[PDB]
């Protein structure tokens, strides 16, 4: 059962948490092909590993800049947690290493592209389609939270679609191991829970709020709280007034009312039955939770793939040459990486 599985998962996690993998490849073993996304501290590139011929996604982070912008702890969290977790809907870290200038995280290449792209392109997902992805997130948060992990950055741009049409969660940049409350103002404006914005101190219930936002956006085509600037979004979030599209089922609106609950003693995922309040909700009544975990459910959408290195499902980004300094930068800050 659930319990069994989760206890053995914790034992494997804690072992890697306490003795993380380090230095398992080097830069010249990969041929860099194209940028898959740029980000605050570098970029993610499609690469080909020369000795196996396999394609991977290499996340590159500039060390000096991470120190300058005071994101060291978050970066070390990201790698320390990603190397230790293992779950069917979490992207797999295959290699990690650092050089004079950069940190590198080499993950499995998820070739279906961001959920974001598919969602904007098609407009919105049907409820069965949104439910198929939402179930994977419910199971993944159950797993992460059991490990005392909070994820803190759910959004369609951090969810990739694999060749089988299942989700791969990526970007553990704000993931943190904490038993109770934490205080950092971080995440993505549309997805922030009211208690984050209100600087109250907060816990893993922020991930269940974010699920509420994700399910809304998947099914509506737009987020429940939107405006042109973050502060205008924050205002609507804290009001917590939510309006639902015409086409939302009654079950869907009732689930969302319980996830997008400003009040912590009332938010689903955070009550006495914990995740089970969500799994047992009527909107998920057709959902076969074990079949999902086992990936035996037919995906509603399968990405069109044209060969292992195909990037057709990603936008184009401006390329920039990867520079590596002949002087080591920030060695001590990133010793454990």
């Amino acid at each position: 059962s659930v319990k069994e599985f989760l206890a053995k998962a914790k034992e494997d996690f804690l072992k890697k948490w306490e003795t993380p993998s380090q230095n398992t490849a080097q830069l010249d073993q990969f041929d860099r092909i194209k940028t898959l996304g740029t980000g605050s501290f570098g970029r993610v590139m499609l690469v080909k590993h020369k000795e196996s011929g396999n394609h991977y996604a290499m996340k590159i982070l500039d060390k000096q800049k991470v120190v300058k912008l005071k994101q060291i702890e978050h970066t070390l969290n990201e790698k320390r947690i990603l190397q230790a977790v293992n779950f069917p809907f979490l992207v797999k870290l295959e290699f990690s290493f650092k050089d004079n200038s950069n940190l590198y995280m080499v993950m499995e290449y998820v070739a279906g592209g961001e959920m974001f792209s598919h969602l904007r392109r098609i407009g919105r997902f049907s409820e069965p389609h949104a439910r198929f992805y939402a179930a994977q997130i419910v199971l993944t948060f159950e797993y992460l939270h059991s490990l005392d992990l909070i994820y803190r950055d759910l959004k369609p741009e951090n969810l990739l679609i694999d060749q089988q049409g299942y989700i791969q969660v990526t970007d553990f940049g704000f993931a943190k191991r904490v038993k109770g409350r934490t205080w950092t103002l971080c995440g993505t404006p549309e997805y922030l829970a009211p208690e984050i914005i209100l600087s109250k101190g907060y816990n893993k219930a922020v991930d269940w709020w974010a699920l509420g936002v994700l399910i809304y956006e998947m099914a509506a085509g737009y987020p429940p709280f939107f405006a042109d600037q973050p502060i205008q979004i924050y205002e609507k979030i804290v009001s917590g007034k939510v309006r639902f599209p015409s086409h939302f089922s009654s079950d869907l609106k009732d689930l969302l009312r319980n996830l997008l609950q400003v009040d912590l003693t009332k938010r689903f995922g955070n009550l006495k039955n914990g995740v089970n309040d969500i799994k047992n909700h009527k909107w998920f009544a057709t959902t076969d939770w074990i079949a999902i975990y086992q990936r035996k459910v037919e995906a509603p959408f399968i990405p069109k793939f044209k060969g292992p290195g195909d990037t057709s499902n990603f936008d184009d980004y401006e390329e920039e040459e990867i520079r590596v300094s002949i002087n080591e930068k920030c060695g001590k800050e990133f010793t454990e990486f």
């Binding site: 605050s40 704000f174 971080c186 085509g221 737009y222 939107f226 405006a227 042109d228």
Partner: peptide, 20 residues
């Protein structure tokens, strides 16, 4: 419509994170 107002807004593209 709400959809038209969203699509005419400034935040329909990939959204960056915030950390302060």
């Amino acid at each position: 419509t709400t959809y038209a107002d969203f699509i005419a807004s400034g935040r329909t593209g990939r959204r960056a994170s915030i950390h302060d």
